[PDB]
Design a protein around this ligand. Structure first.
Ligand code: ZOA
Ligand code: ZN
Length: 259
């Protein structure tokens, strides 16, 4: 267990004491005001190249569940859009709510989605993720909203393994998972400079938030809500509402890839 969390005594309003950058100039997430975001005709097309992805493990880390990838070579990469050079996929994880009307970190005209998927990539010009974490352009997170409706077939393999990683520190083999199955049709996006949304809240992320949500079923998101923050044997505290709220935009502009 880590000291920080999402509760009354350790949640987002407390994080600044250990992580003073929590009150910084480029924190995430933010509200995306669709009427103030501006179309940027100079944004290059986004390239999501996930066909050679090598998934390794699925892990309950006490704040989310993550799927980890082999990032030792250019396998699954993000390029183009606002990005200079090549960003390698390291992991994905989710944020979700106790109810379908909350759970996302980003908001769209103050609308909260049921959940948000973060695909976390690092800039290969810095050689490893730890070095990338120290740079203002070290990371790129592709954010995808989840709404409750039809099931997402490409998520079901994830849902079906969550019973094996109920508590903090549990992991399982999770090879041959294809993250292409988590993507919506459209790659239309908003982009802005921001931060990690969990400690250490490092201000090194280029955010790329897709406009089109994916639909997941009520049964799929209910399985997320059966996970536990606690380790095996501690009082049961459901892993729900593991989202940081919108932070001040301050001196930033959100750009749109689309009209
Ligand atoms: C040299 C190879 O390094 C590693 O093996 C390594 C290092 N770190 C990780 C992570 N965790 C990461 S990168 N955490 C930082 C973070 C990111 C993204 C957001 S968000 N919520 O999207 O803003 C928050 C926080 C997950 N595997 N892994 C691995 C496998
Ligand atoms: Zn995240």
């Amino acid at each position: 267990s880590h000291h920080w969390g999402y509760g009354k005594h350790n949640g987002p309003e407390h994080w600044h004491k250990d992580f003073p950058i929590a009150k910084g100039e480029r924190q995430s997430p933010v509200d995306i005001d669709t009427h103030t975001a501006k179309y940027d005709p100079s944004l290059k097309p986004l390239s999501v190249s996930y066909d050679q992805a090598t998934s390794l493990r699925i892990l309950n880390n006490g704040h989310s569940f993550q799927v980890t990838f082999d990032d030792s070579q250019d396998k699954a990469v993000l390029k183009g859009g606002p990005l200079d050079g090549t960003y390698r996929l390291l992991q994905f994880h989710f944020h979700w709510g106790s109810l379908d009307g909350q759970g996302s970190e980003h908001t769209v005209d103050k609308k909260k989605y049921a959940a948000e998927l973060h695909l976390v990539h690092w800039n290969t010009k810095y050689g490893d993720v730890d070095k990338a974490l120290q740079q203002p352009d070290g990371l790129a997170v592709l954010g995808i909203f989840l709404k409750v409706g039809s099931a997402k077939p490409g998520l079901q393999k994830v849902v079906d393994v969550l019973d094996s990683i109920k508590t903090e520190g549990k992991s399982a083999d999770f090879t041959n998972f294809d993250p292409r199955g988590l993507l919506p049709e459209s790659l239309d996006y908003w982009t802005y400079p921001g931060s990690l949304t969990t400690p250490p809240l490092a201000e090194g992320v280029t955010w790329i938030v897709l406009k089109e949500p994916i639909s997941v079923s009520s049964e799929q998101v209910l399985k997320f809500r059966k996970l536990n923050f606690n380790g095996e044997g501690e009082p049961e505290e459901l892993m729900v509402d593991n989202w940081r709220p919108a932070q001040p935009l301050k001196n930033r502009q959100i750009k749109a890839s689309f009209k």
